[PDB]
Design an enzyme around this catalytic site. Structure first.
Site, PDB file in Angstrom:
ATOM      1  N   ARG A 118      -5.125  -0.734 -48.395  1.00 19.23           N
ATOM      2  CA  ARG A 118      -4.777   0.504 -49.092  1.00 19.23           C
ATOM      3  C   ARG A 118      -3.540   1.135 -48.502  1.00 19.23           C
ATOM      4  O   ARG A 118      -3.120   0.760 -47.427  1.00 19.23           O
ATOM      5  CB  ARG A 118      -5.901   1.513 -48.983  1.00 19.23           C
ATOM      6  CG  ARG A 118      -6.275   1.817 -47.549  1.00 19.23           C
ATOM      7  CD  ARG A 118      -7.306   2.931 -47.445  1.00 19.23           C
ATOM      8  NE  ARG A 118      -7.808   3.090 -46.078  1.00 19.23           N
ATOM      9  CZ  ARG A 118      -8.901   3.809 -45.796  1.00 19.23           C
ATOM     10  NH1 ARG A 118      -9.550   4.435 -46.768  1.00 19.23           N
ATOM     11  NH2 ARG A 118      -9.342   3.897 -44.556  1.00 19.23           N
ATOM     12  N   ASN A 156      -5.369  11.042 -49.815  1.00 21.67           N
ATOM     13  CA  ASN A 156      -6.310  10.714 -48.724  1.00 21.67           C
ATOM     14  C   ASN A 156      -5.626  10.323 -47.412  1.00 21.67           C
ATOM     15  O   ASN A 156      -4.819   9.389 -47.371  1.00 21.67           O
ATOM     16  CB  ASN A 156      -7.229   9.566 -49.109  1.00 21.67           C
ATOM     17  CG  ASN A 156      -8.343   9.416 -48.156  1.00 21.67           C
ATOM     18  OD1 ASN A 156      -9.352  10.124 -48.257  1.00 21.67           O
ATOM     19  ND2 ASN A 156      -8.168   8.540 -47.164  1.00 21.67           N
ATOM     20  N   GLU A 157      -5.998  11.030 -46.348  1.00 20.81           N
ATOM     21  CA  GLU A 157      -5.426  10.819 -45.043  1.00 20.81           C
ATOM     22  C   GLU A 157      -3.992  10.299 -45.085  1.00 20.81           C
ATOM     23  O   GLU A 157      -3.696   9.166 -44.683  1.00 20.81           O
ATOM     24  CB  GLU A 157      -6.283   9.858 -44.294  1.00 20.81           C
ATOM     25  CG  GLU A 157      -7.547  10.451 -43.837  1.00 20.81           C
ATOM     26  CD  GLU A 157      -8.194   9.589 -42.791  1.00 20.81           C
ATOM     27  OE1 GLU A 157      -7.799   8.402 -42.706  1.00 20.81           O
ATOM     28  OE2 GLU A 157      -9.105  10.080 -42.076  1.00 20.81           O
ATOM     29  N   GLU A 317     -15.159  14.274 -43.400  1.00 18.43           N
ATOM     30  CA  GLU A 317     -15.713  12.953 -43.064  1.00 18.43           C
ATOM     31  C   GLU A 317     -16.125  12.873 -41.586  1.00 18.43           C
ATOM     32  O   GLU A 317     -15.522  13.483 -40.712  1.00 18.43           O
ATOM     33  CB  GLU A 317     -14.690  11.839 -43.388  1.00 18.43           C
ATOM     34  CG  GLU A 317     -14.515  11.617 -44.877  1.00 18.43           C
ATOM     35  CD  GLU A 317     -13.238  10.876 -45.260  1.00 18.43           C
ATOM     36  OE1 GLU A 317     -12.829  10.013 -44.485  1.00 18.43           O
ATOM     37  OE2 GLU A 317     -12.627  11.187 -46.320  1.00 18.43           O
ATOM     38  N   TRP A 325     -14.245  -0.192 -38.292  1.00 19.72           N
ATOM     39  CA  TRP A 325     -12.825  -0.457 -38.082  1.00 19.72           C
ATOM     40  C   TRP A 325     -12.412  -0.716 -36.632  1.00 19.72           C
ATOM     41  O   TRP A 325     -11.289  -1.162 -36.381  1.00 19.72           O
ATOM     42  CB  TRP A 325     -11.956   0.635 -38.708  1.00 19.72           C
ATOM     43  CG  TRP A 325     -12.499   2.068 -38.564  1.00 19.72           C
ATOM     44  CD1 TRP A 325     -13.229   2.775 -39.498  1.00 19.72           C
ATOM     45  CD2 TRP A 325     -12.307   2.962 -37.470  1.00 19.72           C
ATOM     46  NE1 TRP A 325     -13.517   4.031 -39.040  1.00 19.72           N
ATOM     47  CE2 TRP A 325     -12.963   4.172 -37.796  1.00 19.72           C
ATOM     48  CE3 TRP A 325     -11.655   2.851 -36.237  1.00 19.72           C
ATOM     49  CZ2 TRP A 325     -13.010   5.243 -36.922  1.00 19.72           C
ATOM     50  CZ3 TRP A 325     -11.675   3.907 -35.397  1.00 19.72           C
ATOM     51  CH2 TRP A 325     -12.353   5.095 -35.727  1.00 19.72           C
ATOM     52  N   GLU A 365     -14.994  -2.197 -46.412  1.00 24.94           N
ATOM     53  CA  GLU A 365     -15.778  -1.220 -45.673  1.00 24.94           C
ATOM     54  C   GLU A 365     -17.239  -1.490 -45.837  1.00 24.94           C
ATOM     55  O   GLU A 365     -18.072  -0.621 -45.567  1.00 24.94           O
ATOM     56  CB  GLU A 365     -15.428   0.220 -46.054  1.00 24.94           C
ATOM     57  CG  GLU A 365     -14.250   0.752 -45.240  1.00 24.94           C
ATOM     58  CD  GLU A 365     -13.727   2.150 -45.597  1.00 24.94           C
ATOM     59  OE1 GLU A 365     -14.050   2.719 -46.666  1.00 24.94           O
ATOM     60  OE2 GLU A 365     -12.926   2.664 -44.786  1.00 24.94           O
ATOM     61  N   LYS A 366     -17.577  -2.706 -46.247  1.00 24.75           N
ATOM     62  CA  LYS A 366     -18.989  -2.974 -46.529  1.00 24.75           C
ATOM     63  C   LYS A 366     -19.913  -2.710 -45.320  1.00 24.75           C
ATOM     64  O   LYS A 366     -21.090  -2.404 -45.505  1.00 24.75           O
ATOM     65  CB  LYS A 366     -19.184  -4.387 -47.114  1.00 24.75           C
ATOM     66  CG  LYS A 366     -18.947  -5.551 -46.155  1.00 24.75           C
ATOM     67  CD  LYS A 366     -19.191  -6.878 -46.831  1.00 24.75           C
ATOM     68  CE  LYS A 366     -19.157  -8.012 -45.863  1.00 24.75           C
ATOM     69  NZ  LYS A 366     -17.735  -8.327 -45.565  1.00 24.75           N
ATOM     70  N   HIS A 368     -19.458  -0.271 -43.051  1.00 23.93           N
ATOM     71  CA  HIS A 368     -19.452   1.125 -42.646  1.00 23.93           C
ATOM     72  C   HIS A 368     -20.738   1.818 -43.068  1.00 23.93           C
ATOM     73  O   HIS A 368     -21.171   1.675 -44.218  1.00 23.93           O
ATOM     74  CB  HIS A 368     -18.272   1.847 -43.259  1.00 23.93           C
ATOM     75  CG  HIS A 368     -18.015   3.196 -42.656  1.00 23.93           C
ATOM     76  ND1 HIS A 368     -18.970   4.191 -42.622  1.00 23.93           N
ATOM     77  CD2 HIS A 368     -16.906   3.723 -42.084  1.00 23.93           C
ATOM     78  CE1 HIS A 368     -18.463   5.264 -42.043  1.00 23.93           C
ATOM     79  NE2 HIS A 368     -17.211   5.008 -41.720  1.00 23.93           N
TER      80      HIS A 368
END
Ligand SMILES: OC[C@H]1O[C@@H](O)[C@H](O)[C@@H](O)[C@H]1O
Ligand SMILES: OC[C@H]1O[C@@H](O)[C@H](O)[C@@H](O)[C@H]1O
Ligand SMILES: [Zn+2]
Lengths: 688, 687
Positions: A118, A156-157, A317, A325, A365-366, A368
């Site tokens: 991303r 986002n961020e 968050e 990560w 991110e599965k 996370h």
């Protein structure tokens, strides 16, 4: 900007917001009813959606589809659940990167950054900005006066991945940034020291971003690097403002935020500065595993509050358990789920949210953690999460909203720009960055039962009884004046090595260090003594006379003022020229107040010194180690209501003086009438 | 379709014994001494021309064969068979210069230049053209030449060029996806591309996983898994095309290519490649240190596994040091012969080295050979001659075509699961699939049990016991195979990191192990990674039987009512792991499942094995000596048994003597009562 907090949906009251990133567009729609039933059971009243839903909205160029988002937003509203809606501009679709590969970022070596993760976009891409503002508009139009939407999550961020761009769009932008900031090329030349190594610029057009200059053994211009880190932050901030400008233009009732990444070690975005462009401050923070877990969370949340200038802030968050990560991703221990959220709360958050609602089966991110794990509703994580919502309603009802984190006795100055400066590869040692020193002092003060406010440098640390100046490498003339005044009028200050070395353009101060400020500190230094184990027989530590030890770096203090007192000296091999030299000093300046610490001592060496130094300065301090066993964090209402949180900082069961008031919350802890009892990872809160 | 290479006109069948041979690096006047010294050594095959492209097609379209004809004639006359390469392993300078578009590109778009070898794009149409032409030319020219007993097609495909990202890769990978999935949505659904705006409108949008920015960035895990699959399949298509051209002109000559099966190899899907070769051949080089023995036995077992117990060909290995590691240790006295006997005992009917004559120059100049630079008066050549002799003895004792016996236990190896555990966003980069099977193999060796290492599509479900070690991918079918295997009385050892995702890297829901929890009897909601990344981190967990888990442990939430707990974790209570379940055993109809909820290591497994096996009802010698010698057994259809014994330790050992005639001994003493082996000794008997 003025402070605008998100407000309740038409009809119900004001509550601590409690929610999560929510991504139904990764599941069959038929899951949306179960999602919502399980949310309600948890105490959840807001979700943030569409954050990365760009390619399921502008499904192809110029084509916008809103049905699936419109359906689920309907279910959420009917359920009493607010929507913090994204622009969904965080990361672009494959169709766009395909048609316009010119939007893709470039690293220092000119490597193209492809899609597959991303945020692969150049912050200053005129094309990406165009597609982006179009989507912002389309979204704003379509949800204008839709009443479920209580706020905007723009992008986002920003810069999490794309801080450093070196593309042609960036070259162009860094030029103009430099023109706008310096006016004339001579002034650029003078800020960067460009007469050194024939780098002198004839014109603004000659200026390049600091692309690759050949790796180890090559040293890029430090002043140019510092500014480039500054520009990168501002380039992303500008992009953010264009996007927010578009959204409130169409729906001006709706407050806008973007999610920051404040943590002890974050070292890019200048967030104190970004905070000037948001209706409310919201932050993402993930726990640091091991011993630093608690102090580093407290540190970061304190800092956020600092940037918020003690206004309420929104934890956008954090994680229920493991992130994905890091190279090793540990899980949380029992109690830490609730206890961490409480810490963010105690440090002033009026909202508490996780990534994410439902754990993903696939994609990067599965693994996370979420509020609802793949294991499903019969899971300890979800049980803890339900308990949390319940405690957060309790706190809402006791009336905590909008109470502010109280003013500590001591401010610890954090300074991102100094962090950047200390990052150059030609400093006295790469083993010293600015970011660690504020964290050690905060941890050290926790060890002595004093909870500090971490405060950015342009905030009002000069209204505190004491300030810590920890590796504040950049001292401007103004910064020097502020400290001199603070001390003249009775301020007590703790100043460390690597402080006040250079002006604000990274030009070293002359006549000795600390520069500008040597009269006030009462100490003079002609050079550093870096320590390590690079080579056999290198000097790798310095003993100090109070029984502590310095590592990485020490100052060589040559002379001290006549009224300067030495508390501690270095103890070493005489031949090192360091034996008996001053390690810790204290010096009066009018009504205050300065202790100088000439080396890196770490959480525990600071903490072991703290008593003798505080005594010298006139700062009252509990000298008992027990004193740090529990961390006490307090929020104060104008009406005088006080909310006090107690946290076990240790790995053993502890007993504390019970505060007065009503017990509102307990996790891994036992209230009694006399005294209070906490287990490891346990938290308590009282209203007085 | 098993075709072993056959003797030259007139000769009998012998264990093949030889080496890569590269006379094109020496003056022709050296060749008579090569051949002479080969004969003294017992050498009966060589493989030549493997990288001889620039010396055959010397310029574009100009093919030259005189030197190769001369030497093949001297070899033929001397009685030495030729395993002839296509010589297409690596292209000439004139080709890459004229056509730099054949050159590979790394994930960052870097040109891979000439100067080493195999710098070519697997799916370069241009290169393919040239290679298939050369293949034909060779085939034509040696058609029905009786010297040539086999084809060595290319060389170690993908050793260097597995990962290409050029435009040819971009295009082929699209088509590969088009074919594997049909419609773009099946792709979108396999890859989870709704996460992070990755959803695809079309196949023309699919890209190979080029650089997405280094640390802190995370490429799509399913797209990466499939790209690894593709890379293997692309090289395979290429090989088949090369072999097809060869066997068409000379259909009587059997074709193979050389694999790189070793414990940690992690590119090519070799079990899948094994379907396109007339016989399976392998390259293996020892792992220095403690792991030297067990890691060779494991790799050789696995090659037999891939061969489905058919005889296989050791194409390459080393007499002593390799050149390619950062430290390159020499073999100790005995290891040269003993290593070849281990490969033999595990079912190889050929034993060849890289290479025949140590090179004076080039990048492999410090790589060991059969004839060292020191010359014929060297310890290495003396041992080689002895090995040659031992292999003639064994041929004469009738060992050929004997199969490796069916062990009591199969250890499942799974390259696709390894690919999956390699993604950078797992619970911990400290866990890969490959190490775990190796630990269980070593572990059984510690208990006097020699296992069969088996790929996942081989027949492990016909054994008394199977090991499922970090088998992270479980398809529905895999899950049904295991269920059946245990229902019908099979006993299974299952570990952490097994059965997490379907075959597309999509996590199983409702708790782990996924699909299979009914049979295992255990329910796991999340992992507990361990390490030292940060101060004070949880870095190990004691187990109650006295072992220690490191790296990763499962958090076992619930166990089935008929699940029995053999060991529990012992931890600081604040960790939430103290007293949790660590090793369990659970009945399922007539089997049979033990669960091992963390990485124990060789020694932790080995120390637990007695108790696990007792609860599963699998006999096991509880004595540690049992593993002092490894026993490997090959069996003829006729009832002949060849039993090799190997010392696994660093002290002298004594074992029960097998019955039969003693055939071979190195660093070992036959006696009539019992047998004596030195460190590094091997003994062999026929019964
Ligand atoms: O821990 C992972 C999370 O990190 C957050 O900061 C980010 O905004 C989320 O989208 C998710 O990536
Ligand atoms: O160990 C060195 C050898 O490695 C082999 O795998 C390769 O096929 C040989 O040509 C040589 O490079
Ligand atoms: Zn590069």
């Amino acid at each position: 900007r003025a402070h605008r907090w998100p407000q309740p949906l038409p009809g119900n009251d004001r509550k601590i917001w409690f929610g999560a990133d929510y991504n139904p567009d990764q599941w069959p729609e038929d899951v949306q009813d179960e999602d919502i039933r399980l949310m309600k059971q948890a105490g959840v009243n807001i979700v943030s959606l569409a954050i990365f839903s760009w390619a399921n909205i502008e499904t192809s160029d110029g084509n916008f589809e809103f049905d699936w988002l419109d359906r689920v937003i309907d279910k959420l509203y009917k359920a009493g659940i607010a929507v913090d809606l994204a622009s969904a501009t965080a990361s672009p679709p494959m169709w766009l990167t395909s048609a316009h590969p010119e939007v893709l970022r470039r690293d220092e070596q000119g490597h193209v950054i492809w899609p597959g993760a991303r945020q692969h976009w150049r912050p200053t891409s005129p094309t990406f900005r165009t597609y982006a503002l179009r989507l912002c508009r389309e979204m704003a139009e379509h949800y204008k006066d839709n009443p479920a939407i209580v706020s905007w999550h723009v992008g986002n961020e920003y810069g999490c991945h794309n801080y450093f761009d070196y593309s042609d769009d960036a070259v162009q932008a860094f030029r103009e940034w430099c023109r706008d900031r310096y006016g004339t090329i001579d002034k650029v030349n003078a800020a960067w020291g460009t007469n050194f190594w024939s780098q002198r610029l004839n014109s603004f057009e000659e200026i390049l971003p600091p692309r690759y200059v050949g790796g180890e053994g090559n040293f890029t211009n430090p002043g140019r690097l510092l500014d480039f880190k500054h520009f990168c932050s501002d380039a992303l901030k500008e992009f953010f403002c264009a996007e927010r400008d578009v959204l409130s233009e169409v729906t001006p009732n709706i407050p806008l935020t973007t999610n920051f990444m404040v943590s002890a070690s974050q070292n890019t975005l200048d967030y104190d500065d970004w905070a000037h462009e948001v209706d409310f401050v919201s932050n993402d923070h993930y726990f640091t595993p091991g011993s630093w877990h608690i102090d580093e969370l407290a540190y970061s949340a304190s800092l956020v509050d600092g940037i918020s200038r003690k206004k309420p802030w929104f934890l956008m968050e954090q994680s229920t358990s493991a992130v994905n990560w890091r190279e090793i991703n540990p899980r949380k221990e029992p109690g830490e789920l609730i206890r961490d959220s409480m810490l963010h709360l105690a440090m002033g958050a009026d909202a508490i949210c996780y990534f994410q609602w439902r754990q993903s089966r696939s994609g990067a991110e599965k693994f996370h953690s979420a509020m609802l794990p793949l294991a499903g509703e019969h899971s300890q994580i979800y049980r803890d999460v339900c308990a949390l919502g319940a405690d957060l309603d309790t706190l809402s009802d006791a009336g905590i909203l909008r109470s502010k984190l109280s003013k500590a006795r001591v401010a610890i100055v954090q300074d991102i720009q100094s962090e950047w400066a200390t990052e150059h590869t030609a400093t006295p040692t790469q083993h010293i960055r600015e970011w660690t020193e504020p964290l050690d002092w905060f941890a050290a003060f926790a060890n002595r039962g004093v909870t500090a406010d971490v405060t950015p440098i342009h905030a009002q640390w000069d209204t505190y009884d004491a300030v810590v100046i920890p590796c504040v490498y950049l001292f401007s003339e103004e910064m020097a004046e502020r400290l001199r005044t603070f001390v003249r009028n009775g301020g007590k200050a703790f100043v460390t090595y690597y402080s006040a070395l250079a002006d604000e353009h990274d030009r070293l101060h002359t006549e000795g260090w600390p520069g500008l400020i040597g009269d006030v500190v009462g100490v003079r230094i002609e050079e550093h003594c870096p320590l390590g184990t690079l080579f056999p027989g290198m000097l790798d530590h310095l003993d100090v006379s109070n029984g502590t030890v310095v590592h990485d770096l020490a100052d060589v203090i040559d002379a001290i003022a006549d009224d300067t007192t030495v508390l501690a000296t270095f103890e070493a091999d005489p031949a090192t020229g360091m034996d008996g030299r001053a390690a810790i000093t204290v010096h009066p300046y009018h009504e205050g107040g300065v202790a100088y610490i000439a080396g890196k001592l770490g959480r525990d060496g600071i903490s072991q010194s703290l008593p003798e130094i505080c005594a010298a300065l006139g700062f009252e301090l509990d000298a008992d180690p027990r004193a740090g066993d529990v961390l006490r964090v307090v929020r104060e209402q104008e009406d005088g209501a006080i909310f006090e949180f107690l946290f076990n900082r240790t790995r053993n069961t502890v007993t504390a003086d019970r505060p007065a008031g009503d017990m509102l919350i307990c996790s891994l802890a036992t209230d009694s009438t006399d005294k209070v009892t906490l287990e490891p990872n346990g938290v308590l809160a009282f209203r007085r």
